[PDB]
């Protein structure tokens with residue numbers, strides 16, 4: 001009942017563009033919406049985010065998260081490891097790669113979502129969420145070697161899965177970080193289960 | 195270590211703008227980033243809210259109430275938590291309860307309210323509060339609930355059992371052209387993982 005009629009380019013950056021989308025509203029009326037798009041999509045989705053479940057025997061299972069300065073936010077954020085999928089890269093392979101680069105961990109694919117939207121009111125950006133397990137008792141993950149690209153500066157924060165929401169709430173209160181909405185949603189559901 | 199040096203307007207729409215962000219990298223070098231921002235953010239602690247609405251009814255399994263809308267940036271229908279911008283002077287809780295009723299017809303009760311969390315912090319500065327609300331589905335007010343969507347708002351309500359959320363979302367994806375929101379998917383995955 002609703003659909004895209006046309007798109008007008010407003011402003012094209014190197015990495016992001018602003019567009020104005022004309023669409024047919026369900027009453028038969030023509031409307032416009034200002035939308036953002038990345039200039040980099042080819043792929044299934046722009047990117048992957050990894051849910052990295054760090055399993056060590058006789059320890060609480062941890063969720064592995066990353067802290068980085070985000071220029072749009074003007075501040076430090078706590079997030080699942082994530083980045084863009086390379087052209088010709090599968091989402092699974094992008095997930096293990098990004099996980100290793102950002103955290104140094106070598107993980108195993110558990111499951112992979114369909115493409116999901118990040119902020120569909122604002123952008124067309126999508127990701128696959130890839131749940132990965134990390135055998136923290138394997139020698140490859142003993143002294144994990146984080147291999148950032150040029151211009152990445154990433155701190156690793158592992159938090160117990162069974163108290164994740166209370167732990168994140170602590171970090172916000174006392175470290176003045178912003179927690180990512182996907183991380184917070186995951187943590188909430190861990191509490192709301194049953 | 196890292197911080198914003200300056201922010202220069204690239205292009206400003208009515209609703210969304212693009213900025214060139216200059217910041218200090220952790221090595222002591224100046225770099226730039228193309229940033230997205232909304233034009234609507236005033237004194238709010240966040241742009242918006244998303245509501246996790248838990249529909250509770252005697253002798254029913256609890257449901258998560260979700261909305262389906264056409265999203266011009268996406269060129270399609272998306273399934274998302276009820277959500278909208280916080281009006282100037284409005285509290286996150288009030289905005290959540292109001293957006294829930296407008297989008298679904300349900301009158302909820304506040305359970306909890308997140309700090310401001312980031313939507314896509316590599317792309318934008320957009321933040322929300324994630325507000326968990328319970329809906330008493332035994333109350334007569336919530337018996338035959340009708341959306342009161344605003345001008346240009348067109349919303350379908352989809353209520354799915356919490357105990358099978360991920361499989362139900364997967365079945366909707368497999369039977370139509372549409373996209374699940376990343377927050378919804380993250381919440382459904384943690385329900386499974388718990």
Ligand SMILES: CC(C)c1ncc(Cl)c(C(N)=O)n1
Nearest residue numbers: 032033034035121209210279
């Ligand atoms: C709900 C807010 C964000 C809004 N209202 C109306 C329009 Cl038309 C747009 C837009 N992006 O152009 N955004």
Ligand SMILES: CC(C)c1ncc(Cl)c(C(N)=O)n1
Nearest residue numbers: 015016084226227228229316
């Ligand atoms: C990772 C990609 C999306 C990227 N690389 C470098 C820059 Cl500098 C920007 C930007 N938005 O300005 N984005």
Ligand SMILES: [Cl-]
Nearest residue numbers: 053110131387
């Ligand atoms: Cl798991």
Ligand SMILES: [Mg+2]
Nearest residue numbers: 081082083102
């Ligand atoms: Mg990254």
Ligand SMILES: [Mg+2]
Nearest residue numbers: 082083098101
């Ligand atoms: Mg990376």
Ligand SMILES: [Mg+2]
Nearest residue numbers: 276277278297
């Ligand atoms: Mg809305």
Ligand SMILES: [Mg+2]
Nearest residue numbers: 277278293296
């Ligand atoms: Mg609304």
